[PDB]
Curated annotation (Swiss-Prot), chain A:
CC annotations in GO: cyanelle thylakoid membrane; photosystem I reaction center
Pfam families, per database record: PSI_PsaE
Source organism: Cyanophora paradoxa
Gene name as annotated: psaE
Family: Belongs to the PsaE family.
GO biological process: photosynthesis
Membrane topology type: Peripheral membrane protein
Its biological purpose: Stabilizes the interaction between PsaC and the PSI core, assists the docking of the ferredoxin to PSI and interacts with ferredoxin-NADP oxidoreductase.
Protein name per the record: Photosystem I reaction center subunit IV
From Swiss-Prot, chain C:
List of residues binding chlorophyll a B3: 1, 9
Family according to the record: Belongs to the PsaA/PsaB family.
Signal peptide positions on this chain: none
Transmembrane portions of the chain: 46-66
Purpose: PsaA and PsaB bind P700, the primary electron donor of photosystem I (PSI), as well as the electron acceptors A0, A1 and FX. PSI is a cytochrome c6-ferredoxin oxidoreductase, converting photonic excitation into a charge separation, which transfers an electron from the donor P700 chlorophyll pair to the spectroscopically characterized acceptors A0, A1, FX, FA and FB in turn. Oxidized P700 is reduced on the lumenal side of the thylakoid membrane by cytochrome c6.
Subunit relationships: The PsaA/B heterodimer binds the P700 chlorophyll special pair and subsequent electron acceptors. PSI consists of a core antenna complex that captures photons, and an electron transfer chain that converts photonic excitation into a charge separation. The eukaryotic PSI reaction center is composed of at least 11 subunits.
Natural source organism: Cyanophora paradoxa
Residues reported in the UniProt entry to bind phylloquinone: 10
Subcellular localization, as worded in the UniProt entry: Plastid, Cyanelle thylakoid membrane
Upper lineage: Eukaryota, Glaucocystophyceae, Cyanophoraceae, Cyanophora
Protein name per the record: Photosystem I P700 chlorophyll a apoprotein A2
Curated annotation (Swiss-Prot), chain G:
A biological process term (GO) from this entry: photosynthetic electron transport in photosystem I
One Gene Ontology cellular component: cyanelle thylakoid membrane
Residues given in the record as [4Fe-4S] cluster 1 binding sites: 10, 13, 16, 57
Protein localization: Plastid, Cyanelle thylakoid membrane
Bound cofactor: record note: Binds 2 [4Fe-4S] clusters. Cluster 2 is most probably the spectroscopically characterized electron acceptor FA and cluster 1 is most probably FB.
Record's protein name: Photosystem I iron-sulfur center
Cofactor needs: [4Fe-4S] cluster
Enzyme Commission number(s) of this protein: 1.97.1.12
Swiss-Prot record, chain H:
Signal peptide (residue range): none
Sequence ranges of Basic and acidic residues compositional bias: 132-139
Keyword Transmembrane appears in the UniProt entry: no
Residues of the full protein shown: 78 to 216 of 220
Domain of life: Eukaryota
Keyword flag Secreted: no
BP-aspect Gene Ontology terms: photosynthesis
Entry GO terms, CC: cyanelle thylakoid membrane; photosystem I reaction center
Family stated for the protein in its record: Belongs to the PsaD family.
Gene that this polypeptide is encoded by: psaD
This protein's name: Photosystem I reaction center subunit II, cyanelle
Organism: Cyanophora paradoxa
Keywords: Cyanelle, Membrane, Photosynthesis, Photosystem I, Plastid, Thylakoid, Transit peptide
Function of the protein: PsaD can form complexes with ferredoxin and ferredoxin-oxidoreductase in photosystem I (PS I) reaction center. PSAD may encode the ferredoxin-docking protein.
Disordered, as annotated region: 115-139
Length: 62, 131, 72, 739, 37, 57, 80, 139
């Protein structure tokens, strides 16, 4: 279980920020798949900084 | 309206020349309009070959120049045969049903181009070497 | 030409040559069966590289032969 | 009506800190490294971020002051280096023998070998800019007059730079001060062009003509009185052309015939120098002034009399062309790009007209015998002119994307050209293919005929002749025109059409450039290569908004790389990419014009004259039978005349040899950007960010590959720089050695 | 203006102006340094 | 000749002027027509026509 | 025709639909939640393959993909 | 339906539109009501004038209809554009709005066509689907 503000590492192998550190901005309090919103320092090639991940793709390195 | 209307678009001075050439003329059969097309193009095509040739100051130059021009007409008979073999497959009908739209007469057109093309190449060989 | 210039210049150049062929009398009658398009993106990378590679090799083989056969 | 605003922009350094301050897209910080190139791309494009035409035009006005500053700064350096570091004083005593020189090189690592034996007791770089011949025609005899002019340009540079600060930060004019085109045309015609040619006509009479009358009498540059003495001492201006003793009474009483000795129509070349007669050019700009001052009283202002350009276009409409020119005035007083493209077209079209009128009618004394300068003066202004014509097709395309309004343009002359653009482009498409076959193929024919041992079947002068009869006739009506249809002129407009050989020193100043079978071929190469260059640029203009392929190409922009790999692939569809492709073709077109020029003159025109009168040219009349085949263009021009740019190592011409190979590098380096694409490098950089992220020091400004539009731009920039600077080095190292 | 001189193009230029002029003045008093003597 | 050319410019080019009645007025506010904008116009044109006429003959 | 497949990491942002120049895409309600949406491509025969729907998807490595298949007259974008 | 005949805008021009492809198979027509007599750019060349209308325009491509249908929603705010594709010498009537609403708006009753119940990193290798009729993205 990840909470907001927690510094996570992404295990989604397709992501631009795979195996990189980001801070969770929020989690969605419903049963929606991919609820974990992580904000990253580094922008991807579409110059965005957020994505929706699941709890299986993140860890709790804090 | 989809087509542009310039003042010289749809002018009767050039719409009358188009309607009377042997590609759009109404009275002709495909054997005749292949002959009229073939007689005109074979007549001038021997022009550049006898005056601009690899051999021009020879015995010698009027025949071999006109031998080259009938060489084009026998090449272009194949092109008119191959265009008819390809574009009219099964004699593919369309909305207009002319010689150009559906096939419907096409084997006669190529022979008409063959007869008039080889004619006027040889006909202009008479007016240059002789006459 | 196939390396520097790329495709959608030529696709918009053929869309006017298609027009000028469909509106020219005595040639409006002759019709293609294949709609003319530009060479594809992967296609003219190969076409540009082929002309590059043949021209690379043909030029040296003419120079390497004639610069040595003239003197030995 | 002058209307301004008082202090709209403060003079602060708060925005000097932040780069990218002007736009909402920038100044947030570079998250990637494209921002470093996004910043330098859209700075001087004021129209994108600022959405007020009043604010946009104030930026544009005060920026030309900054460009006026850098030209004056550059002009002062032209005058300073002629004052300090030049042999201009020794050159006036012997102008044929001594090579013109400035730019002494410092005694460091070995580049002081470039300070060569250039003439007299001076050592420096033999320059090819013609400033020595321009300053002699201006009358300058000592270096003090060059030194004060270098100071005079720097104070003028500060004057323009202050005026750009003042007219944006302090007193910025409103929009209505800029939209007054009739008062602007009135002022620039009579004031800038008329008084500028009236006041320069004053210099050529009082200053240039007296000192040159003694210089072509050949006394000394020291014995000649200073040019203020020709204003003060009226006895001194009376011993040479004694019509100054009557004053301005021939002028006001219309008895202008008394000025027949310093306002002539002699019209030839000086037999002592080989330049135009200065009394012709004195009479010239005086006649140009009155034509320009009178024409500046044409357009209407706040005094009622005068033409209105808005009502000349209304009721200039025919039956072919619909609503006529109605709307082109309102387009031209609102679009800054349509004003830019048209003023760029005829600035670059003029710059090639300047090149053609200056090798054949050499305006300056000892410019014609200076083959080292007359070729570089031609090849410069041709090259300057072709860049500006590509900027015409560029900025006409930027007009179409955001300044074109369909509501203002219904059935006018912009609408009706954008409605039959498929008829314009395809008829332009055919005439390139007709000209490419029937001009280049006549070289391919002549290659194949001379290779096969058939020299009687090619197109030559001892073969199937293609004589240029439409140009040889015009050579006849202009060579026999002095005395018959221009009866007051003593000699012809030029010696290039027909006339004697003017021989100044031992060398040809000018001689009749004949036209033959080869000249038919190259002038149709020129006709071909220009028509393709038009075809790419005009396709970009007419299809800048839409096509059958992409119907919303103006919603995507003037400068975007592609609409994807769909529709078969839509790479280089935008209006920017046609400017990118036309740059090579402009490079392709102009480089033949400069290859045509450099060998036409060396074989038929330029050369030496013996003591009897026979001419022996430079390359020895080998343009006639060599320049009809591509092999003769390779063997007798590019291989035979680059024998001075490669044998130049170890001599004073060595920096031409180093610029030769060094520009072959930058040209070939450009193909790395042109032939390849971006997405290779963006995954190659992903291996290099890893090897920096491994050692924990990867930059926070994330490295990106250059964009698709930038990779095209950085490849065309090094392409032109690589080939022009090769042609720069080949031309300079050749004609310095032989001419 | 001092915060302007800390920006990348100017401080990329004046240090390159410094490091070039370092190398320029070296070859004036110490010319033609092939090897260490 | 020159004084005739100002009348020839004032009779032909005079009614050619499209905008009439503008300023400035005459300095004594007189009831004189052809306002001194137009008088400087036809005299300059009269000096233009009268110059080529004199030099042409 | 080109194949367009929409993956379940979509968020109902509706950005790829309004960036389509040939009106291929549309929004549809989702089964398991019945509140959020997903894009859908019921008109893949109209797809030219411009990949503008991938330039507008905000998810990291976009939820809608375009695989350029066989080229018909629509997907070639031909006016003839 | 298409409501042909409907008045073409007052245009007279455009070489660049509706050539021989239209008469054999598949041309398109966009129909709208323009609430002025104002000028608008065409995808062919630029002007016509929109009628009071019932305005109709016969275009060559669907891509040219949505480009014009975007201009009427942008510049004139007339979003009532209703494109079609023709009969016997055409294919499919009533192309847009396909379900009575714009595609960016949600409408129940639509079915998720082309949906995948997986991510893109969960796509199989092509070696697993080698020598089969399955493709590496279809489900
Ligand atoms: C000297 C005092 C001074 C000061 C403090 C300012 C300050 C300002 N100016 Mg002003 N201005 C000035 C004089 C000054 N200006 C002058 C002399 C001109 C005439 C050129 C202008 C014309 C002008 C315009 C049109 C604009 C400004 C703007 C600005 C504001 C932002 C500019 C900026 O941050 O980039 C600083 C820029 C630089 C450091 C680059 C200067 C480039 C110089 C001029 C030429 C360099 C080319 C050179 C020849 C290099 C060639 C290549 C090389 C390799 C050889 C800032 C308040 C902008 C503004 O107010 O936006 C709202 C704006 O649009 N100024
Ligand atoms: C048009 C622009 C321009 C260019 C490209 C040059 C180029 C040159 N100048 Mg010149 N100069 C110019 C304008 C120019 N100048 C102006 C406007 C003045 C009057 C202010 C001068 C006054 C001047 C003097 C007194 C000297 C030069 C010198 C030089 C040469 C050495 C470069 C150098 O010393 O930089 C040094 C580097 C910096 C200043 C960077 C800080 C170089 C060829 C030198 C020379 O030719 O020696 C033989 C030299 O002594 N220049
Ligand atoms: C007779 C008086 C007069 C003179 C001598 C000039 C001269 C000039 N003006 Mg012009 N200008 C004038 C009146 C005049 N102007 C009036 C009355 C207007 C407004 C209607 C303008 C509006 C104007 C603009 C917008 C620009 C010029 C520019 C120029 C310069 C052209 C560049 C060049 O060739 O050097 C030149 C110095 C250009 C310039 O260099 O601006 C700095 C320029 O961009 N002028
Ligand atoms: C437009 C620039 C210009 C300027 C500033 C001058 C200025 C002068 N001229 Mg020159 N001149 C000019 C053009 C000019 N001229 C032209 C275009 C002609 C041919 C029509 C002449 C033909 C001329 C003659 C024949 C004479 C002058 C003379 C003079 C001087 C006294 C006249 C006076 O100011 O009252 C004065 C320095 C007089 C003088 O002092 O000469 C030494 C004199 O005799 N001028
Ligand atoms: C030297 C290399 C080269 C060549 C030969 C061409 C040729 C052409 N370019 Mg290309 N181009 C080039 C470099 C070249 N370009 C580069 C580097 C770029 C990137 C900037 C471009 C980008 C470009 C643009 C943007 C455009 C062109 C266009 C054209 C065509 C002009 C039409 C014409 O006159 O054809 C005449 C044909 C020739 C001169 C070829 C000579 C061959 C002889 C005469 C005939 C062949 C002999 C024989 C019959 C062969 C058949 C026998 C065999 C089958 C057995 C022509 C095909 C333009 C176009 O297509 O518009 C119509 C156009 O708009 N090119
Ligand atoms: C970029 C850094 C740099 C460095 C470390 C030096 C270092 C030096 N300079 Mg140099 N100088 C430089 C740039 C530099 N210079 C530039 C850019 C110019 C052109 C304006 C000069 C023009 C110059 C002159 C004219 C002289 C020096 C001299 C010197 C030496 C004496 C110390 C001094 O500062 O005076 C010292 C080795 C002097 C010297 O000792 O020469 C014998 C000397 O006379 N310098
Ligand atoms: C990249 C390959 C390379 C290498 C290994 C060298 C090495 C050398 N060059 Mg060469 N050279 C090169 C590229 C190279 N150069 C290029 C690209 C050019 C054209 C611009 C030249 C043109 C050139 C000339 C004209 C000369 C040299 C000289 C030298 C010698 C330096 C003498 C000296 O005082 O430095 C020693 C430097 C120091 C002790 C200071 C080190 C600290 C500095 C300031 C750090 C700067 C970092 C930025 C040295 C053997 C000179 C020579 O001695 O000929 C035999 C010489 O006259 N070079
Ligand atoms: C009505 C009487 C009249 C006569 C007999 C002439 C006669 C002449 N004019 Mg003139 N001219 C006139 C009025 C006249 N002009 C008027 C009203 C103007 C407008 C102001 C001009 C403006 C003018 C110009 C610009 C030129 C002539 C020239 C000429 C001469 C040659 C004409 C030619 O060859 O073409 C000839 C002597 C030409 C000439 O060579 O002058 C000597 C010449 O360049 N004229
Ligand atoms: C060429 C002579 C020419 O320009 O004729 C002039 C003619 C225009 O005549 P109008 O008197 O209708 O023109 C009024 C305006 O064009 C200018 O006043 O041009 C056209 O019809 C278009 C030419 C197409 C160019 C065809 C090639
Ligand atoms: C000229 C050009 C075209 C237009 C080329 C076309 C339409 C093909 C025209 C070639 C004609 C048919 C002549 C080709 C004949 C060859 C000599 C032989 C071909 C037959 C082989 C199978 C042997 C592109 O489509 C293109 C696309 C992408 C990048 C660059 C370019 C590009 O440069
Ligand atoms: C080489 C190449 C690249 C890679 C080139 C890049 C990334 C440019 C980077 C090179 C510059 C020189 C990096 C500059 C870094 C610093 C500014 C250096 C500062 C040093 C100071 C002392 C001045 C592309 O991105 C590309 C894209 C599209 C088509 C072709 C190409 C292409 O050919």
């Amino acid at each position: 279980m990840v909470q907001r503000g927690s510094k996570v590492r992404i295990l989604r192998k397709e992501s631009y920020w795979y195996q990189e550190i980001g801070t969770v901005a929020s989690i969605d309090q419903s049963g929606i798949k991919y609820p974990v919103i992580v904000r990253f320092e580094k922008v991807n090639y579409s110059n965005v900084n957020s994505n929706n991940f699941s709890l299986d793709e993140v860890v709790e390195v804090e | 309206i989809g087509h542009l209307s310039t003042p010289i678009s749809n002018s009767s001075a050039v719409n009358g020349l188009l309607a009377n050439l042997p590609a759009y003329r109404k009275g002709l059969t495909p054997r005749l309009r292949g002959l009229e097309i073939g007689m005109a193009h074979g007549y001038f095509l021997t022009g550049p070959f006898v005056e601009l040739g690899p051999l021009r100051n020879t015995d010698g130059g009027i025949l071999y120049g006109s031998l080259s021009a009938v060489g084009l007409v026998v090449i272009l008979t194949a092109c008119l045969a191959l265009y008819g073999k390809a574009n009219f497959s099964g004699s593919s009908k369309s909305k207009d049903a002319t010689l150009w739209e559906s096939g419907e007469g096409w084997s006669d057109f190529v022979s008409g181009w063959l007869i008039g093309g080889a004619g006027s190449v040889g006909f202009a060989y008479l007016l240059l070497q002789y006459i | 030409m196939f390396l520097i210039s790329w495709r959608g210049y030529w696709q918009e150049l053929i869309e006017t040559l298609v027009w000028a062929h469909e509106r020219t009398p005595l040639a409006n009658l002759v019709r293609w069966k294949d709609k003319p398009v530009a060479l594809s993106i992967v296609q003219a990378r190969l076409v540009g590289l082929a002309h590059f590679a043949v021209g690379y090799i043909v030029t040296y083989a003419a120079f390497l032969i004639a610069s040595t056969a003239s003197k030995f | 009506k002058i209307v301004i605003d008082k202090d709209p922009v403060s003079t602060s350094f708060d925005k000097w800190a932040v780069p990218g301050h002007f736009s909402r897209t920038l100044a947030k910080g570079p998250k990637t490294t494209t921002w470093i190139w996004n910043l330098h791309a859209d700075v001087h494009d004021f129209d994108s971020y600022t959405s007020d035409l009043e604010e946009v035009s104030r930026k544009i006005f005060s920026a030309h002051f900054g460009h006026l500053a850098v030209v004056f700064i550059w002009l002062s350096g032209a005058y300073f280096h002629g004052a300090r570091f030049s042999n201009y004083e020794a050159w006036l005593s012997n102008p044929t023998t001594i090579k013109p020189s400035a730019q002494v090189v410092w005694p460091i690592v070995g580049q002081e070998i470039l300070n060569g034996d250039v003439g007299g007791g001076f050592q420096g770089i033999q320059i090819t800019s013609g400033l020595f011949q321009m300053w002699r025609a201006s009358g300058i005899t000592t270096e003090l007059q060059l030194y004060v002019t270098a100071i005079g340009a720097l104070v003028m540079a500060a004057l323009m730079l202050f005026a750009g600060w003042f007219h944006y930060h302090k007193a910025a004019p409103k929009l209505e001060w800029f939209q007054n085109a009739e008062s602007m045309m009135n002022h620039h015609l009579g004031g800038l062009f008329g008084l500028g040619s009236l006041s320069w006509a004053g210099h050529q009479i009082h200053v240039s003509l007296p000192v040159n009358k003694l210089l072509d009498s050949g006394v000394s540059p020291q014995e000649i009185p200073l040019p203020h003495e020709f204003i003060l001492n009226k006895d001194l201006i009376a011993q040479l052309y004694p019509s100054f003793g009557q004053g301005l009474t021939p002028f006001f009483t219309l008895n202008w015939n008394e000025y027949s000795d310093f306002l002539t129509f002699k019209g030839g070349l000086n037999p002592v120098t080989g330049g135009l007669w200065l009394s012709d050019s004195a009479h010239h700009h005086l006649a140009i002034a009155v034509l320009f001052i009178v024409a500046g009283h044409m357009y209407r202002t706040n005094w009622g009399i005068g033409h209105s350009m808005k009502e000349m276009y209304d009721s200039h409409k025919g039956p072919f062309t619909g609503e006529g020119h109605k709307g082109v005035y309102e387009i031209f007083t609102n679009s800054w790009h349509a004003q830019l493209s048209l003023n760029l077209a005829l600035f670059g079209s003029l710059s090639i007209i300047v090149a053609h009128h200056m090798y054949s009618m050499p305006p300056y004394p000892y410019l014609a015998t200076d083959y080292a300068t007359s070729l570089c003066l031609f090849t410069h202004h041709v090259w300057i002119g072709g860049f500006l014509i590509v900027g015409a097709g560029a900025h006409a395309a930027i007009f179409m994307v955001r300044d074109y309004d369909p509501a203002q343009n219904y059935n006018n002359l912009v609408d009706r050209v954008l409605r039959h653009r498929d008829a314009i482009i395809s008829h332009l498409n055919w005439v390139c293919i007709f000209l490419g076959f029937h001009s280049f193929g006549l070289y391919i024919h002549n290659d194949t005929m001379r290779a096969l041992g058939r020299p009687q079947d090619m197109f030559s002068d001892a073969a199937i002749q293609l004589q240029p009869v439409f140009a040889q006739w015009v050579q006849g009506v202009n060579s026999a025109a002095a005395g018959n249809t221009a009866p007051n002129a003593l000699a012809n407009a030029s010696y290039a059409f027909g006339g004697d050989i003017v021989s100044v020193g031992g060398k040809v100043a000018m001689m009749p450039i004949s036209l033959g079978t080869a000249d038919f071929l190259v002038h149709h190469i020129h006709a071909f290569t220009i028509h393709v260059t038009v075809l790419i640029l005009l396709k970009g203009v007419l299809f800048a908004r839409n096509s059958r392929l992409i119907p919303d190409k103006a919603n995507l922009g003037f400068r975007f790389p592609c609409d994807g790999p769909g529709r078969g692939g839509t790479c280089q569809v935008s209006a920017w990419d046609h400017v990118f492709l036309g740059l090579f073709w402009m490079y392709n077109s102009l480089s033949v014009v400069l290859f045509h020029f450099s060998w036409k003159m060396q074989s038929d025109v330029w050369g030496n004259v013996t003591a009897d009168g026979a001419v022996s040219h430079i390359t020895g009349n080998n343009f006639a039978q060599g320049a009809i085949t591509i092999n003769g263009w390779l063997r007798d021009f590019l291989w035979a005349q680059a024998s001075q740019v490669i044998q130049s190592y170890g001599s004073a011409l060595s920096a031409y040899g180093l610029m030769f190979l060094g520009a072959h590098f930058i040209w070939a380096f450009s193909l790395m950007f042109l032939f390849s694409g971006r997405g290779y490098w963006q995954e190659l950089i992903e291996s290099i960010v890893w090897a920096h992220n491994k050692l924990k020091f990867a930059p926070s400004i994330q490295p990106r590959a250059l964009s698709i539009t930038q990779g095209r731009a950085v490849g065309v920039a090094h392409y032109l720089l690589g080939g022009i600077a090769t042609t720069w080095s080949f031309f300079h190292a050749r004609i310095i050695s032989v001419g | 203006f001092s915060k302007y001189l800390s920006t990348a193009p100017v401080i990329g230029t004046l240090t390159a102006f410094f490091l070039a002029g370092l190398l320029i003045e070296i070859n004036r008093f110490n010319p033609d340094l092939l090897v260490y003597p | 000749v020159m004084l005739a050319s100002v009348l020839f410019a004032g009779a032909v080019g005079g009614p050619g002027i499209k905008m009439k009645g503008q300023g400035p007025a005459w300095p004594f506010n007189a009831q004189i027509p052809f306002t001194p904008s137009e008088f400087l116009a036809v005299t300059a044109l009269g000096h233009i026509i009268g110059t080529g006429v004199i030099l042409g003959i | 025709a080109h194949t367009v497949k929409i993956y379940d990491t979509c968020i109902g942002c509706t950005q790829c639909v309004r960036a389509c120049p040939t009106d291929v895409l549309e929004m549809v309600p989702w089964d398991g939640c019945r509140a959020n949406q997903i894009a859908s491509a019921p008109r893949t025969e109209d797809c030219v393959g411009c990949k503008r729907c991938e330039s507008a998807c905000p998810t990291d490595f976009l939820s809608i993909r375009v695989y350029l298949g066989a080229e018909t007259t629509r997907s070639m974008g031909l006016g003839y | 339906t298409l409501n042909l005949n409907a008045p073409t805008p007052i245009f007279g021009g455009s070489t660049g539109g509706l050539l021989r492809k239209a008469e054999v198979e598949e041309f398109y027509s966009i129909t709208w009501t323009g609430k002025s007599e104002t000028v608008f750019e065409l995808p062919t060349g630029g002007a016509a004038i929109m009628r009071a209308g019932e305005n109709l325009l016969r275009l060559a491509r669907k891509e040219q209809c949505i480009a014009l249908g975007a201009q009427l929603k942008d510049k004139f705010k007339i979003t009532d554009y209703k494109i079609y594709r023709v009969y016997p010498s055409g294919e499919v009537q009533f192309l847009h709005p396909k379900d009575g609403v714009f595609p960016e708006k949600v409408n129940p009753g639509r079915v998720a066509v082309g949906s995948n119940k997986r991510r893109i990193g969960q796509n199989p290798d092509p070696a697993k689907l080698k020598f089969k009729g399955q493709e590496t993205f279809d489900s």
